[PDB]
Design an enzyme around this catalytic site. Structure first.
Site, PDB file in Angstrom:
ATOM      1  N   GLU A 158     -21.839 -96.328   3.564  1.00 35.27           N
ATOM      2  CA  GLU A 158     -22.259 -95.019   3.315  1.00 35.27           C
ATOM      3  C   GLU A 158     -23.779 -94.136   2.786  1.00 35.27           C
ATOM      4  O   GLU A 158     -24.206 -94.706   1.149  1.00 35.27           O
ATOM      5  CB  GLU A 158     -20.945 -94.849   1.520  1.00 35.27           C
ATOM      6  CG  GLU A 158     -21.202 -93.352   0.702  1.00 35.27           C
ATOM      7  CD  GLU A 158     -21.257 -93.874  -0.334  1.00 35.27           C
ATOM      8  OE1 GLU A 158     -20.306 -94.562  -0.797  1.00 35.27           O
ATOM      9  OE2 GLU A 158     -20.867 -92.228  -1.067  1.00 35.27           O
TER      10      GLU A 158
ATOM     11  N   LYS B  12     -18.653 -93.934   5.159  1.00 34.91           N
ATOM     12  CA  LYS B  12     -19.162 -92.598   4.473  1.00 34.91           C
ATOM     13  C   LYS B  12     -19.643 -92.053   4.418  1.00 34.91           C
ATOM     14  O   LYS B  12     -20.344 -91.677   3.599  1.00 34.91           O
ATOM     15  CB  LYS B  12     -18.188 -93.499   3.308  1.00 34.91           C
ATOM     16  CG  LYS B  12     -17.694 -92.598   2.247  1.00 34.91           C
ATOM     17  CD  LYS B  12     -17.534 -93.430   1.575  1.00 34.91           C
ATOM     18  CE  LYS B  12     -16.545 -92.878  -0.209  1.00 34.91           C
ATOM     19  NZ  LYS B  12     -17.026 -93.033  -1.572  1.00 34.91           N
TER      20      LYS B  12
END
Lengths: 363, 349, 351, 353
Positions: free
Chosen positions: B187, B229
């Site tokens: 992420e 992500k």
């Protein structure tokens, strides 16, 4: 962290449009961009004297084949000399290519040079005055370019320096091309030379391609306006272990899926020394590989498209038709191959089955 | 120039299989991995004491929602505390999640830390003893992990240092996870804060992702066994120019297409402060975008799946069914969205 | 292209003053920062139980040697445990060190971890919560830290990943230290393990140090407020070809001159398994090398300063004086060595 | 992790000896490598037609100055054209230079080119066929070369791409030179243009030089066989704040100490637009700076050595003597400056950076 648009929307469109036309479904690239010193070796294998006229004649023979190759050829790469030559009817070769629905390409690199401090490794030169050259080539009929970098697998190669430097110079070349309305085909060729196996070639190819796209990103390259000309992933030419075509296709598509962004318009594989048949068969297996492939997978063959032709011609003006026929046969096979609809029958003599491998190839 | 296999064929298969289950068609991720401190503000907004019991009850409330969420949730991210709690009936939460068809995930980073010499930029810590923690979490039911890096768009940010350091730490985290049978979700969140426009966000996102995948390659990360992500590509919160959902979708998909290798099993977008409806509508537009997308495009929503649920709950057990119903509606909404079935000149990108 | 000052003029002065005191002329570092596991086989060789009291007694033995060692020791590195232990007189060890004119150092790394996808290579951990740890260590008397990264010369090592990753973590560690008034000693140790020759070690050392300093620059590290603890350049431990001390010195100084910016306050060489005498003779040769050296070239010895002391002690309290005596001898020997005044009694283009 | 020697001990010695000779105590470099285009602006400023003969005459004027400059000039950089011209007596210019104790240098880059996707930034070209050119230049009298990269300080520059690319091309240039027995002078010039202050320039200079030396390391460049031609660290031309020469010297030396390995044989500063007197005083203050400097700190001036000479000449043969006297005076002044012995007379904090 701040964007300074290298290209306008109009410029991007022209490049994207050109790249897509070259790799349109069923289409590939004829690479007849061999230099005088490189083509001479081929003309020598047929007792033909390497003269400007013989080179002109040979190129004309390929560019003026019957209309059956039209759907098979999306682009044709030429060397400087040929770009300015004319067919017997007086038509400039670029005009001959365009009239058959092909896009004209030009090789712009100036060959490889040694990298000091390495074990026989090189980088490629040709950036000086490249912008002006591209502007002129564009005016004279060319819409894409070719630049070759060469890497070799060995105990200490490719080295960190060789990978970084070659990736950087390719990025510079691509940047200059896109500023002049020319689609750059990035060619980071990893030679088949050596006795390494399939997984070794896959590993090196993945590392090289990751370095290439990072460089292209650092240099602000418009991927949709580019094409990639990589080596297929295969075992070394002297590797003892044998592999099937399905395995070569799997290793190839896997390496590409792990490194080539979907934005890249297409991948035009180099034959790299494989026989005409082997190149077509592997290309076919690649297109049939189950894995998802977000980019066109076609060909940009030099040797694998001219083997039988050169032999049939033999330097005799009377073997024109015969020679052209052999070329057309390979173009049709590869046109089917890049669609996964190719299946060898039994024709195409030993010529199309002979190994076209040449240690440390340079053209 | 020489390969030293980080993973065996068996380890690769396991990671790849886990990654594919999480983002299977129509499925997404419920991110209920908030820490005590990060959940504090939300609980305070509904006048609820931040106790372990209320946190347990709230998490239980979401994890035990009716079977309608089953086909919508492919994975559930939990914070350490929740991974070891049980429902009222005695079933461990991991077991609850798995019984409903979901894969259990665990947040493993230890928050952001300031990067000296930068304009308020950060990197993320949490690598110490991470291998041991992953082995323990795996044994205890988790099959994937979450690690958050944060970048900001400003006059001089994200800087070269911030981009390089965050990509490298993400690669380290990824490597350790894969050695322990845990699928790492990478992420690299670029905050929406600021008055920058859509073009600016797309540009920075492309540069950050390019750096991330180069780092993943340098660290020998098995892409098929990972998920990405990222933030969707949107204008800054204080941007005065307006854009349509189709433009946000076009900018987002274009950015991803230019940097994310096809081998990446899936992209699970964070909601990043967007409203429940906005996040769903945008995810829907992304999936309807004409361009070719070689990876699953779904959700990994924390706030965008809990807003209405938290409010309906108000910290009152009597509101259990009311709250779950709100969560179930967003789970259904986003499941259709990640399929482009939800109803409320690319050269220019 | 835009600066965002990591340190103020005051913070820089503090770090620079500390770094200079540690490597002042004739002074070096006593590295007694061994953990329970690393000191284990050490105490085990002398049939001594590896208890907290024995470790405390042994550390006390070294730290309380007579004033003769004072001008030889600019700094002393301790492990967490020892930083909080006290001598028989009730004085905390940090105070014992300071009262003798020495600067107190603390090892802060959490050991090496394996780098997946490499042939047995590692990086080092310990950054988590390091800032808070540094802030506390500072309050407790420490002014500099130690962090060890390990690299090995092999058929395919050190790899690009190992060099890049270890260089990067050292930079992160240095950054955090400087933010807390702690002078970071950067230790990118290239092990002597293997049969590689002198030229190979020099090559690898040059490449590793170039990577290290580029990383320190990328992370905005204040070099004047740091020290470097590298391996000397020597042939591999199992190298068939033999070399002289002068050759080792020439290769070492040449590698440093090609990679270490003049701004670095000092270089504190690790002994790396060398015998006490060899470590001192080589350090002397290094300081006598006829090339210009813009930084102090001293020592940060662990094993090469305790070998004879540990043996003389033997775990017996009655051998206290004898043991300290051996330590003092090595302290005096190396103090002269870092000045090129130690005596047991051109063609640099080939490098 | 394996070494494949780019150079032999013999080759290293040749390169090292050449580099040291150029920056020997009291000596600097006369930069007379202006092209026809660059030297065009300097000729029309004194009402002189830009012809090959006029350029020859001018270059000859500087090269044939009396022996007072001998101990001042360790090297002279020429443009291709000049390397093949001869003095009135028929002696090739490189011979004239050598007989006066100077080493001959040649500019080999082919100018800057725009970097797409940047805010007006550039890189430099000239690598194509460079090896053959160096071999030829070596044979024809040159022992060192010059290559100029240009970076600019602005709101978004120098960018990461510009820094990386220019550092990489300088390394390629250096590698080719050393393979041909030519000492490469690396010139990463950060322009003074702009309203940035001293701290800004020092920061950018430090970041640029760190990148330059990392690239030279990656390309296996032999540092002892190279020289550095950087900009001094100064405030921007439009900077409202004012600084003393001691501050400029402190910022400059500090920046160099933090990035340039001591193996580098010497640093030859470019005048970068400073006046002849300004360039001499700053060079002198640099050499007087208290900090330790492990490399020779001298000059490689073009404009700061020719400003007055050009004006005095005015394109008239009758002013030859007067024009040379102006050049000689600057050579003597800078010779003393690179030793910290310069004084207006006739030959007679630190943590805040």
């Amino acid at each position: 962290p701040h964007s300074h648009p290298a290209l306008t929307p109009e410029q991007k469109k022209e490049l994207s449009d050109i790249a897509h036309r070259i790799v349109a479904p069923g289409k590939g690239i004829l690479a007849a961009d061999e230099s005088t010193g490189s083509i001479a070796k081929r003309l020598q294998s047929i007792g033909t004297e390497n003269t400007e006229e013989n080179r002109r004649f040979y190129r004309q023979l390929l560019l003026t084949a019957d209309d059956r190759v039209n759907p098979c050829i999306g682009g044709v790469i030429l060397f400087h000399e040929t770009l300015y030559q004319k067919a017997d009817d007086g038509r400039p070769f670029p005009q001959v290519i365009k009239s058959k629905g092909g896009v004209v390409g030009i090789k712009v690199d100036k060959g490889v040079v040694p990298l000091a401090g390495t074990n026989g490794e090189t980088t490629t030169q040709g950036l000086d005055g490249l912008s002006e050259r591209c502007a002129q080539y564009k005016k004279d009929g060319a819409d894409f370019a070719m630049w070759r970098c060469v890497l070799k697998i060995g105990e200490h190669t490719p080295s960190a320096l060789a990978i970084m430097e070659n990736a950087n110079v390719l990025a510079r070349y691509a940047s200059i091309c896109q500023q002049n309305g020319i689609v750059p085909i990035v060619e980071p060729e990893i030679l088949p030379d050596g006795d390494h196996d399939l997984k070794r070639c896959q590993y090196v190819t993945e590392k090289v391609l990751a370095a290439v796209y990072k460089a292209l990103s650092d240099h602000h390259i418009y991927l949709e306006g580019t094409l990639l000309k990589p080596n297929m992933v295969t075992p070394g030419h002297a590797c003892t272990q044998k592999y099937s075509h399905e395995e070569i296709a799997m290793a190839t598509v896997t390496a590409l899926r792990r490194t080539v962004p979907p934005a890249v318009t297409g991948v035009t594989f180099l034959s790299g020394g494989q026989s005409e048949e082997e190149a077509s068969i592997n290309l076919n297996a690649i297109n049939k590989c189950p894995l998802l492939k977000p980019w066109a997978l076609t060909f940009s063959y030099g040797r694998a498209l001219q083997a039988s032709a050169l032999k049939a011609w033999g330097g005799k003006k009377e073997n024109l038709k015969a020679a052209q026929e052999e070329y057309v046969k390979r173009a049709l096979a590869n046109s089917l191959a890049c669609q996964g609809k190719y299946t060898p029958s039994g024709q195409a003599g030993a010529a199309a089955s002979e190994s076209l491998f040449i240690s440390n190839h340079a053209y």
